Amino acid sequence: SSTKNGRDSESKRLGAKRADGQFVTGGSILYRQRGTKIYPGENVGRGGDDTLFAKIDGVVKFERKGRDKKQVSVYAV
RNA sequence: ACAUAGCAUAUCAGAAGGCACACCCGGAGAACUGAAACAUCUUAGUACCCGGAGGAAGAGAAAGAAAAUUCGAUUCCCUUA
RNA sequence: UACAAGUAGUCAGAGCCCGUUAAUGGGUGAUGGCGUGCCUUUUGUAGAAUGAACCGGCGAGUUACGAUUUGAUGCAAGGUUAAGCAGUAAAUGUGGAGCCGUAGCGAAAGCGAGUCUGAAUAGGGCGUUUAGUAUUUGGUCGUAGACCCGAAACCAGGUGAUCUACCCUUGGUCAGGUUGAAGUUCAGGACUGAAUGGAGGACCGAACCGACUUACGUUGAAAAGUGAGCGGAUGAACUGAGGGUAGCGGAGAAAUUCCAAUCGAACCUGGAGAUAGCUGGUUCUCUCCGAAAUAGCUUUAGGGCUAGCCUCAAGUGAUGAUUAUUGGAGGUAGAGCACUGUUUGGACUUCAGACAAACUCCGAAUGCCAAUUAAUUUAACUUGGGAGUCAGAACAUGGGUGAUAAGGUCCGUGUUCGAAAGGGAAACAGCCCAGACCACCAGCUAAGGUCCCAAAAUAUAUGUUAAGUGGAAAAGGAUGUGGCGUUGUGACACUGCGCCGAAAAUGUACCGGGGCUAAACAUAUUACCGAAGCUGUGGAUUGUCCUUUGGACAAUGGUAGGAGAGCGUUCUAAGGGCGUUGAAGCAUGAUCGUAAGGACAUGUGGAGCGCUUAGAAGUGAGAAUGCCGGUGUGAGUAGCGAAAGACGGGUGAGAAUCCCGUCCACCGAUUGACUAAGGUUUCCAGAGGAAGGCUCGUCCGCUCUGGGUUAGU
RNA sequence: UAGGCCCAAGCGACUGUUUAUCAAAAACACAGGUCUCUGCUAAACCGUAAGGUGAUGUAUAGGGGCUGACGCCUGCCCGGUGCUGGAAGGUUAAGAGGAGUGGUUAGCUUCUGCGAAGCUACGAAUCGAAGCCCCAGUAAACGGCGGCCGUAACUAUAACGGUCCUAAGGUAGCGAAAUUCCUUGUCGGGUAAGUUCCGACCCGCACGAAAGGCGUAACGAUUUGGGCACUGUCUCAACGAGAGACUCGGUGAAAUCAUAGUACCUGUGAAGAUGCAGGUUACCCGCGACAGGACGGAAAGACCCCGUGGAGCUUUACUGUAGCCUGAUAUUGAAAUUGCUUUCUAACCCGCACCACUUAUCGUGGUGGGAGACAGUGUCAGGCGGGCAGUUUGACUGGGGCGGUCGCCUCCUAAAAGGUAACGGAGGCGCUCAAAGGUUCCCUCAGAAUGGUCAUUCAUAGAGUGUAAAGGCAUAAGGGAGCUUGACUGCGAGACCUACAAGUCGAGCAGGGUCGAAAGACGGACUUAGUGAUCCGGUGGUUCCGCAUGGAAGGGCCAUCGCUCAACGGAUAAAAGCUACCCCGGGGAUAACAGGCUUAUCUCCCCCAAGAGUUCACAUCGACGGGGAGGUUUGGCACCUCGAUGUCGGCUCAUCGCAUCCUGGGGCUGUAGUCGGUCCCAAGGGUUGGGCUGUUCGCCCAUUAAAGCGGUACGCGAGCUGGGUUCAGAACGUCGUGAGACAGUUCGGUCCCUAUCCGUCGUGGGCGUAGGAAAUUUGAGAGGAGCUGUCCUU
RNA sequence: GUGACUAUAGCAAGGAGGUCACACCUGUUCCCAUGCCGAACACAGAAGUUAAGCUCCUUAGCGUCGAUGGUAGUCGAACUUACGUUCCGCUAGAGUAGAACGUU
């Protein structure tokens, strides 16, 4: 009567890692993701795996890109 | 054949057995155990057992130790650790 | 104290009797309220889970050496000795070999306040902290049995065949009867018949040896028997004596059967205190704090290790929390069909309508992350020493699974129990209220209630219900009844409360009981009762602020566990004391302390003990189916071991039982006579009656005191 | 005092033997049969050896394996595997051999290179037996003996055919059997009644020829069925005798025991209360008796599970071993002929003869004979070797076994941050690319409508993206083309994740470059799977070390390689099973019974009413659907009990519910009467005796007014039995290589207790009831009884 | 021309605009190019033409934004098995914006 289910993956902690309006140091991770759910703004860059990191230590502010898309910019403190 | 096995007399405080469930030196020599199982390994060359001593026993007089400008049998104690 | 329902106490309390360490006295206790022992183990025990009959004594984290951290002390870029020698088994002197430290980095060569990687201080890792060290107090860990008790087992060296298995050597026993093979002998004619013969793991059947059935016994007469029957009973029989085979072995007509009441591998001593991730137990008091039942890995799943949650010390120092505000990320509930599927009815792609955990054109409530924002509060982190936890439960709620079963099972969030007493739910860990420092015969409230049991309203205003509905349950039925609205005295939609549907087993038995027509319901007013909550008073310990070192405020449930302060016992040193005009101890007492406990007085006792301050421990017992001793209960109970005794006469302190006599009874292939093994004086006579004899005893196989065994065969 | 007999059947031929103490048998032995080894220092066995037994025997003898008198027989196959035999080959050890490399250094003389002899670290080709591969044989060696269809001179059936497979397809006999699940097979016999028995048939799940087949006179403390006789076994009990019991005198235990002033009921509770709640009942003390409760007492559950617990047994589990065979070599000599061969004598050997020690089957010596460099013995090597030994034989798990799974990736569950479980719902991975990477430029899809791959309009977007799924992408991350190797070297501020080890991202910096005119981009692929600690071994470099010194051997560092170590944090280089012969430590953390919750299943009741019932839905019946009750069955959960809660069915005794079988009272009928059907009230009483089966249920027989259904631990084992059920023996079929297991089936098999409390049944005493008595009573309350037939009359 | 901007910008319909700017338009002579095609790409250029593009103005047919009010849904609380209070407040749908704001 045995079944052929019962196996999942490992959950990979995947989501926003800094809050809008927080002071970040210049290499912190800002958002992890599969494919661009949010885009790299100004002073921010995406690497392989598309994770968003801040190049320079400033403030992080989530913004809008058109009607649908979004973006993560890092102003200067 | 010579002879040598035997055989029979004689001498000998020769030997024998015990004993301290202590010590020591050889012969032979487990297992439970630890390895969180188990076999190499460990317990352990331990327990028991057998033989020989002796008041001690064994070791002992460099075919050694070392690497300085050397020491000079063995045993044992502290360290090296 | 003989009308009463009892974890045997506790609070209140008359009545009766006494009279102390003399102080809100002691003993008893009609009666009323409350109240289901203690440990252990558990999610959870009154538990019908464990364990303890009771009393007394004994009985469980210790020591040696190392490491680590903490307190104290001594010195300080230094600290310090080890063996040895001297010394009273002592300090102590001496003994600088050795160790730690002031310098680190690298695998290393080797550099050095730097170094390694590197082509490159480029960057980066590790250093430049600039005080260590020695001894000792405590915590903890390591190696030794290492908190105590407890295996089944394994190995080595011996002791066992007097039982039982098999064999060997030499002996013995089997009442009686029945049948009638071969063989032979005769008469015949190879074979027949009659005599004879006495064969047989033959037949019947005692001893003998077994053990089929069945009853009895099962704290037995007996650790395998007795009664009645039953089988072999000249043989593969039974049996005595002397011998032999021995445990990694031996014997087996073979059953895992026997090897000294024990055998899938004997018994004894040693390794040995084997090991036990398992059960059980683990001894004095108080004060403060106070969990977990989770993640990960695991030859792992009732174990362990790191992390999460607790505790103590030091430090940093606002970094903690709830709220307000703003910003944000994210796709749930909801909803919708634009995507992917599913789908109804038409029209002929399209109108209208539906479904979705793995659909989304959309999209909350909450929760989450922030600011360096404000407001109330006072935690938070780090580095250290120490742990415990890894079996969780119910309740509400969001889901999976199951069957929109389960006091089911698995996860998110919360609460309580765990570890939490008090009030309500009748009783009832988890439900509602509420967190016990202690005393009080004071007050206010909380859930919940106010007819009586049972504290407080037979309150108040307005209505509903007649079923005892209240005070267990549906589909469906139906001129029950009230409200309200729409309708042509009839008909309707919504509704309030009721009826039927409605059957279970010891006893009413689905309000806790009486009882209730209001003491049930719906809405609103008051009053009051009601807890260990809060308040008032007094008290006790911790704290922090100094109004005035005074007060003032705050805290004080607790299991695993962490920390502190103490009591008591034996001994030791020093000091100072008591004591034959009475020590220790024991008995009684109405005494002082917050507890462990400390005094005092009187009896008993007869010769040693306190007290202060330190030191050292075989330092505290209610639990181990703990060990040893005593003593209960069961209880005047079961039993008193196969069977015929009676009377007379004695002896006697005492006679169912001892002696003598008469009668009677039982055995008689034996209950008689004799001997081997074995026992080893039990044999006889005089005396005895403490213990033994399953009762008694004047008796004896018992006790005391003297005697008894004679060999050339 | 002293045989019951007869008719049949299964097993075993017979007498015998067996589990001391739960099994006496169908088990063992057996006389007989057959296979096999053994030439005598026999084989086999004991002991390390000497030495023995075998046997003071010798192939008509000795050991071992199977079967089991007697009679008739004993069929077939040699794949595989065991055994005997053969030696062509293939393969294989020590030992022989020593081409040949490396180390060192005299010397060379370059300057890291050459290299004598030695000493030394390793070696190659060749020679090296037995074994294994290979070739045959063997079946009273181990074992094993098929399917699927069609078809008349046998109605349906299949003598006969077609096909595939192999070692070979089960012969003679027997057959629902100690073997048959279905199944109490079908038939006949026996009985009034036959799950047993007998006789047959044959769909032989799953008979069958020496683990023998079939049959058999005699024998059996064997198993089974049936008669005659006989009976207290029984209907259905009665009385008498003795012992215990009871009362008296004497003596006088024991297990047990937290303290007890110890009631019932309905509840509640760790879900089965003397002790809690609420009610109901009970004056204080005994004595005799019974056995419902104290989850009564003994025995730290023999069942079940768990110990990384033991023990015994098995095997083609792992690693070993006593032994046995085979080679080189030492003891170990000569001759011939070519290391294989053959001859000789002195080594060695003689359980050979004689002689002497010696008025000894020991031994020693001497002499002959035989054997002879072999044997035996020592060291070394190979092989066989459950004969024996030490051990391993996973976990999760709605108990365990069987089934499945175990590591990584993507979804949903997942409750809009992240994380989040189940043996919840779906899938994938253990790679692939030298261009499917980088860069630079250009380009835009899928499908329809149109016409006959092509052309155009329409076409956010439905394609493609290597590969799952999700998230993204028309900045293109999709397509095409040029150029190249960044699929770089040393690193890395900071961050996410995180128990640890790991994992992921990363600006920027230096060395070197590729593309581009340049800014710039580039440390693989649109993102996320495609992987495995350490230890050890190998290889390439190197700066390090190299035990007096110089080299080297060997190490270290850097770079790579070797793990379905897939049980994927990997226990070792190396590992399966049974126990019903079992053993210890634990658990109600976890099963079997009973209890508890649930009600899927079960029993019953109802709603709607399409219909059937001559028309008529509702006398009776009730499709498709719907809603309940109960707590008897089959289950689910796993809450109490594993320091013990004893099973099914009968016997004794009952008691309760009502969902009524009979008797009592009614309604409606498709009720003429008798007789019925279906509802309704009713629990007072009653509710049979046999056959078969362990049986309950179930069928049958003969009656009756009727032959009720349920609860009470499927009531009751301190009241009884012990037939079945799961103890140890033995056997059948089947499975297993095996030890052994059941789907099974069959024959045999120790049932302990002296009653303390409550409870019940009897029977006394103390006090009470306002003086002490005797007698007669009322009766609150409680208990008993309560059934029915058939005849005649109307 | 070139940036910002959440389609309120778009899709659509009409109608109007010529070389002074924007194209279409003329050809391969080279620069460069088509897996064929001076189609595109790009080079030399004036003619002929707004027809088309483009831009400017008008239309609310689709597209998009979208209030209010109520409802669903819940945070929390209190009786209890799903109603009652208080706050937050949707989707859908009707009223509406709307034929683009805007730098250098």
Ligand SMILES: O=C(NC[C@H]1CN(c2ccc(N3CCOCC3)c(F)c2)C(=O)O1)C(Cl)Cl
């Ligand atoms: O001691 C013993 N049991 C102690 C406990 C357990 N139990 C008990 C009762 C009945 C059974 N059944 C019924 C059906 O399943 C098999 C047999 C059972 F398995 C155990 C009981 O009542 O008490 C036995 Cl060994 Cl005598």
